[PDB]
Amino acid sequence: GYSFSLTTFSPSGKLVQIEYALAAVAGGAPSVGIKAANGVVLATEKKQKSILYDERSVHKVEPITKHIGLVYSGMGPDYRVLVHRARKLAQQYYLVYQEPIPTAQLVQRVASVMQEYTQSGGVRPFGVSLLICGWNEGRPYLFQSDPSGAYFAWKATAMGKNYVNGKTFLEKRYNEDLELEDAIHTAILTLKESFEGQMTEDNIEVGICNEAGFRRLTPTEVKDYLAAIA
Amino acid sequence: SAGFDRHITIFSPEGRLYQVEYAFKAINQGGLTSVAVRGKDCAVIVTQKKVPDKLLDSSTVTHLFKITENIGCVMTGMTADSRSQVQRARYEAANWKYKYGYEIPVDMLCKRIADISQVYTQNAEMRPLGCCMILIGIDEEQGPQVYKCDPAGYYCGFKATAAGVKQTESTSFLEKKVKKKFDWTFEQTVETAITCLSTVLSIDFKPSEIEVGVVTVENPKFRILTEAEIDAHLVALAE
Amino acid sequence: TGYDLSASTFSPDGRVFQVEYAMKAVENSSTAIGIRCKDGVVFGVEKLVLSKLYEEGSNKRLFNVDRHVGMAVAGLLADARSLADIAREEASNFRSNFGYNIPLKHLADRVAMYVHAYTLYSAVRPFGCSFMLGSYSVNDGAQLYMIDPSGVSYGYWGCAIGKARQAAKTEIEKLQMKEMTCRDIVKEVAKIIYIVHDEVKDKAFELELSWVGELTNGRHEIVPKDIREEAEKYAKESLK
Amino acid sequence: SEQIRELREVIELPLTNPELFQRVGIIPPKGCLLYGPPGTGKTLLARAVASQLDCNFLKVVSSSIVDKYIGESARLIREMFNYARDHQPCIIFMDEIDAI
Amino acid sequence: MADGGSERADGRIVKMEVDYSATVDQRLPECAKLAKEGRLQEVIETLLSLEKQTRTASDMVSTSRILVAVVKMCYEAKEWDLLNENIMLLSKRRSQLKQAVAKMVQQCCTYVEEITDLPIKLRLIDTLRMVTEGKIYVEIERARLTKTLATIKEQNGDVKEAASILQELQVETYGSMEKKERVEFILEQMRLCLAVKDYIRTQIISKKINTKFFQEENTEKLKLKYYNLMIQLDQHEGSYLSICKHYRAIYDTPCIQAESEKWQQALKSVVLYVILAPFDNEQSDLVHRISGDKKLEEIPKYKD
Amino acid sequence: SKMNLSEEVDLEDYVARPDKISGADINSICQESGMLAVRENRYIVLAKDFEKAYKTVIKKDEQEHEFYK
Amino acid sequence: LRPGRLDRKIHIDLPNEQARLDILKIHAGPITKHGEIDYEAIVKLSDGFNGADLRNVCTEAGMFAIRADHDFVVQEDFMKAVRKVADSKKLESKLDYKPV
Amino acid sequence: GDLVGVNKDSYLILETLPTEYDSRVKAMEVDERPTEQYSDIGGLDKQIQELVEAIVLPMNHKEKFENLGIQPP
Amino acid sequence: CGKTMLAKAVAHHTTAAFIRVVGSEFVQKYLGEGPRMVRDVFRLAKENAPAIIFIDEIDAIATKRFDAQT
Ligand SMILES: [Mg+2]
């Protein structure tokens, strides 16, 4: 192999170290995100290695502004860097324009941050992909960045381990028009496809977007939502 | 197999990197084990000492380190990397009081520590400090807490805690220990903190071979136990 | 081993050999011991004459950092000279910012963190020196410290640095050092040097004894054992 | 003293009692892994298992069977069973399982 | 060193009645502080066994009466506290507590014909607490077994005492089987299993016996007479040819033990139901072996 | 079928479980509970060991360093 | 690691500091002496940490008995033997070996 | 292992004639007896003792390895 | 998932000459022995009965995907 480095090409194809960085994304915790007709639902998987770990200490669904949330699938230590980057970057729009930043504008800029660590030549890229949600100007949005620097606009997707089983699930599942309450029902039902044995109120962690702003769900509702609703 | 990324900090094919996870086995050259236990409104650190010389002193050996007046810690791993980690912990604890005007939470401090350990993984050209840190502290409206920072930049707060050489044997004891709903009335905490380390190491130690740091919600100051009252808790469990 | 070039790389089992290689470079240097009594610290260095043209007091290994602080270096001598100038410069800023003498517990922390910084980057190498720090005060008593090339620094009652690190501390620990005076220590340091290989397979040597404590009123200076020559008179009687 | 016996009945009870292996029904409890130092443990506590019956021993050098095409090696399996067929449970002592 | 504790124990055995026995327990923690020292050779195991001997001898005098509770509460006192007394991390398990209580289970063998059943099983239920921990490894491994057999013969055996011995069988193969007495203990429980009418478990624990044979040379009336209960196991279903092979195995010893009634009924019992086995080649040549006997013509079933 | 279980302990409580098991490890479960009764001197499986043999072989996620999830 | 190849595994440890004295008195067996020996005074001064190498310690103590014409073995000869044998153990490289 | 004399055609043992060697082994015995002393060798004083303690003393003292009761390699 | 067991189940209720070969003993050294062991199987097979040749694993060498300039 040529690869060994980031500042040169292969004689045939593309940059190989960015492809190896995507392998760490696929070996992460699974996640799912569904864009409904009135909101976007984020849901992820969160299991401790033991019964000793306090579950209410470190969170996965993480708000950026009062209408923008964000999840990941990769390495949590690299995740905390670009979250703190995206917080301070979102305030710089608000100091200039005095207006809450639209969701298509962070993804212009957050991907340009993940761009810059793919430069020369002694730094490493991230090993984290993202999912960014928000309800700006009526219509809600659901995007996805990558360590290479590109981005998307999804109807529904799933990252992490066993994403091909969740994708063929959602290809057979996701329709165009449902409410947010039906969207969470098919967002846990796709998390049950690749989860482990027990699924309690602490194994999952779910956040939503209304038009009334971003909100993450406390385990009182999530216990009552997973209570026999499939 | 790899082989590939085993000199510097770049990726492997599928999918990890090895220089950070070689620091996880860089703790084990200390030859030491530390245990932290949170059961109820108090919090207990316990760690043995190993003095191999009579010319060697006693006061300059202790791994219990007072960060602020209400926050104490213990250090494992190799010795020289541990103390430079403490110097950053003492420094940024005072910047919080200067910038923000109040006492720093124990939760907020491990964010500031693991982010410094994060840059050394992301950006290269500095050895990533092969030591581990365990914190305790009292929080208002939250009770006592126990946190652990990792050399990779990971942190998680959790109730019963082991480190050093014998994590997988001590945590296996504490999973079976913290499953019954017994209360933890400040001597149920200490006696389990002794007998877990006492059976995993298989030492059942003589009184002058350990250290015990404590904090409690009746006196939130960090407190290192006197050698006399260490004997008092040792004669308490073996009645 | 190949995985041992830089100081910023780890072995597959988890240690840095560049620190390990620099430790046993101190092993090839001659023995320098240190000891403290109840009211002072007494140094002592076995130092060998190179050929003959040495001029009786050159290139010494008993330095003088502060008014009450000195060193007892061993290893690469040129690397210890640059390290001694750091401790001279560090104690000056504590005077200019706080107005009183540097405590030895705080001085050894500032030096050992500076030695630690040369064990992290690939541009620089770790030091090849180990040394002693002895001081005396009226509010703190006498202290004696010990710094390896890795940067681990804590206190002893007695120590040795050189070839005979183990072979000297065997007979240091059979002394009742907790109650002796540091005038009786000086005649006892000289026999520890002359037992273990002063000129047996080597050519020649010369003894140096540094000295700090209550009798010097906190000053650090060399012994007046050119006066009355009592160290060699008492230690050479231990031939049988 | 703990390992004289922990290895004893994990070998003794399956060979002495194959009838319990039809009271529920499974044939292979096929032995422990003795790993650690060279020391004296590999050669001496093998003679501790020799205390009752045992005997057999023979020897497995872990080298004369490891020839590359395994059409010979499968015959070199059953070549050693030409004496292991001559008895009751023969006890094939096997040295340097993993050593080339 | 510890001879002062012996001459103080010389004082307390005189002052068991002159002074009150709680003062013997007040001179006791000084001897515990001597055991707390226990450094290298001065006040260590050999002299520690002497205070352990004399504190048990004082426990003998104090609880020879029906005030039994002092010897028991002194035991959970010291045997929980010995982890703090002598050496930490599993001190010796070597003559620091063993013969002090191996004497006491020998005393429980003495008092069982004198003391009634109630305070001796209170004595046994308090010594089972530390026998489950250690002290029955070897010499004496049957400190448990000479008293758990006593618990069987308290109420002289039932379903529970058969369960009480089956749970404690292999713990002295976990200590060291005794060529003879271990075989004599590991046989005894299956006649209790026959009392609970257990037959499949009985032959499993009977198959352990078969490799320890030819010790009937030094055994007069025990080895080939317990196997008269092994035919009771094969009495059950049909195995008539096997227990005629058995009778020829127990045929030998009453010809060594030259009897003319016990040995003659061995000829009587074997000649009855070789017939009752189904016909085989094995029956056809066995009758060709046992006929032509010089002893068979004593009985008119030579005609049969 | 070719194993004397002989209890009233229903196995389908382990059919309905998640934590998908490879077909070779089903063979490991029934053989381990065979060991986990005979070694304790039982002539029949009592299927109180069958819980422990199930929980033994399912624990294969060994270390993962609590890192990169 | 399936049931049927390595059904249960067990690790052998190198030190005990008290099973030294077991293996020591085995190798301090058929060697002529007075019964003068404080065998624990050997063990506390011994740092061998290998059962096959404590066999070498009793071998070289007889070499010190060949020295100075000792048909017996004095207690000093074992203390001479530890300083020769255990120092020779310290002067060898390649100290990474672990069974998996 | 005997070097017997056997008839050609009959293949029958006739004589015994044992212990016969070729000239190549007889040339391997040293009749030179060189003149090297231990004073000529320098710098190997540890290995000089460890050779004499291993080979020379079993050549000389057969009984010193008997009354002590060990085995020389 | 029960792969080799299915190959063993065919070998019972067939009337063929079952041949199982691991895909690892011909990736060895001694340049030229590898491709001849492939010939040694089929010359032994086509001389014989209706036969089954079960190669166990080729998750070893099964893929070209580049021109080897090595
Ligand atoms: Mg297969």
Mark yes or no for CB contact A54/B122 under 8 Å: no
Which positions in chain E touch B206 (Cβ < 8 Å)? 88
Tell me how far apart the alpha carbons of residues G57 and G89 are, in angstroms, rounded to a whole number.
11
Tell me how far apart the alpha carbons of residues G86 and G49 are, in angstroms, rounded to a whole number.
9
CA of F31 vs chain A CAs: smallest distance (Å): 22
Mark yes or no for CB contact I28/D68 under 8 Å: yes
Name the residue in chain F with its Cα closest to that of B16.
Answer: F68
Tell me how far apart the alpha carbons of residues E107 and E62 are, in angstroms, rounded to a whole number.
14
User: Hunting for tokens 């089972």 — which residue is that?
Assistant: E128
Tell me how far apart the alpha carbons of residues A126 and A81 are, in angstroms, rounded to a whole number.
10
In terms of C-beta distances under 8 Å and separation of at least 24 residues, what long-range contacts does B99-103 make, across chains too? B103/B68, B103/B70
Which residues, 6+ apart, have CB-to-CB distance to A15 below 8 Å?
A: A6, A9
Residue I20, helix vs strand vs coil: strand
Tally Cβ neighbours within 10 Å of residue A210.
14
Nearest residue to G80 (alpha-carbon basis) of G64, G69, G91, G68: G64
Ligand-binding site membership of I32 (annotated): no
Which positions in chain D touch F45 (Cβ < 8 Å)? 24
Ligand-binding site membership of D47 (annotated): yes
Closest partner CB to D32 (pick from G4, G9, G51): G9
Mark yes or no for CB contact D70/I28 under 8 Å: no
Backbone angles phi, psi at B99, to 5 degrees: -75, -40
E206 within 8 A of E169, measured Cβ to Cβ? no
CA atoms within 13 A on the CB side of A159: 29
E167 contacts chain F (CB < 8 A): no
Tell me how far apart the alpha carbons of residues E61 and D8 are, in angstroms, rounded to a whole number.
45
Which positions in chain D touch E204 (Cβ < 8 Å)? 17, 19-20
Ligand 1 centre and the CA of I63: distance in Å?
Answer: 20
Tell me how far apart the alpha carbons of residues I69 and A102 are, in angstroms, rounded to a whole number.
52
Q: Which domain holds residue A128?
A: 1-230
F9 contacts chain D (CB < 8 A): no
The helix (run of H) or strand (run of E) holding residue H43 is: none
Tell me how far apart the alpha carbons of residues A132 and A103 are, in angstroms, rounded to a whole number.
8
In one letter, which amino acid is A65?
Answer: T
Mark yes or no for CB contact F67/A74 under 8 Å: no
Sign of CA dihedral B66, B68, B72, B76: negative
Give the bridge partners for C71, in sequence order: C133
3-state secondary structure string across chain C: CCCCCCCCCCCCCCCCHHHHHHHCCCCCCCCEEEEEECCEEEEEEEECCCCCCCCCCCCCCCCCCCCCCEECCEECHHHHHHHHHHHHHHHHHHHHHHCCCCCHHHHHHHHHHHHHHHHCCCCCCCCCEEEEEEEEECCCEEEEEEECCCCCEEEECEEEECCCHHHHHHHHCCCCCCCCCCCCCHHHHHHHHHHCCCCCCCCCCEEECEEEECCCCCCEEECCCCCCCHHHHHHHHHHC
Ligand 1 centre and the CA of E54: distance in Å?
Answer: 70
Question: DSSP string of A36-79?
Answer: -SS-EEEEEE---SSSSB-TTSS-SSEEEETTEEEEEES-HHHH
Given the candidates 3.90.1200.10, 3.40.50.2000, 3.40.30.10, 3.60.20.10, the CATH classification of the domain at C1-240 is 3.60.20.10
Which positions in chain H touch G59 (Cβ < 8 Å)? 70
B40 within 8 A of B65, measured Cβ to Cβ? no
Between strands B131-139 and B34-37, the pairing is: unpaired
Which positions in chain D touch G52 (Cβ < 8 Å)? 38-40
Which positions in chain D touch E211 (Cβ < 8 Å)? 16, 52-53
Which positions in chain B touch E83 (Cβ < 8 Å)? 204, 238
DSSP B135: E
A23 within 8 A of A146, measured Cβ to Cβ? no
Which positions in chain E touch F39 (Cβ < 8 Å)? none
CATH number at residue A68: 3.60.20.10
Total of domains in chain A: 1
CA of G46 vs chain H CAs: smallest distance (Å): 21
Mark yes or no for CB contact F67/B156 under 8 Å: no
Name the residue in chain B with its Cα closest to that of F67.
Answer: B154
C8 within 8 A of C117, measured Cβ to Cβ? no
C15 within 8 A of C21, measured Cβ to Cβ? no
Mark yes or no for CB contact G65/H68 under 8 Å: yes
Ligand 1 centre and the CA of E254: distance in Å?
Answer: 63
B19 contacts chain C (CB < 8 A): yes
Which residues, 6+ apart, have CB-to-CB distance to E117 below 8 Å?
A: E154
CA of A23 vs chain F CAs: smallest distance (Å): 11
CA of D69 vs chain G CAs: smallest distance (Å): 23
E-facing residues of D in 48-87 (CB < 8 A) are 52-53
Mark yes or no for CB contact B154/F66 under 8 Å: yes
A149 within 8 A of A115, measured Cβ to Cβ? yes
Closest partner CB to B55 (pick from C12, C14, C173): C173
CA G83 to chain centre: 12
What is the arrangement of strands in the sheet containing B34-37, beginning at the earlier edge strand? B160-162, B34-37, B42-48, B210-216, B219-224
Distances (CA, A) of E235 to B191, E229, E240: 58, 9, 8
Resolution in A: 3.2
Mark yes or no for CB contact F44/D23 under 8 Å: yes
Q: Which chains touch D (3 or more CB pairs under 8 A)?
A: E, F, G, I
Ligand-binding site membership of D42 (annotated): yes
Tell me if there are at least 3 CB pairs under 8 Å linking chains I and D.
Answer: yes
A31 within 8 A of A44, measured Cβ to Cβ? yes
CA B64 to chain centre: 9
Between strands D33-35 and G9-11, the pairing is: parallel
Ligand-binding site membership of G50 (annotated): yes
Name the residue in chain E with its Cα closest to that of B239.
Answer: E81
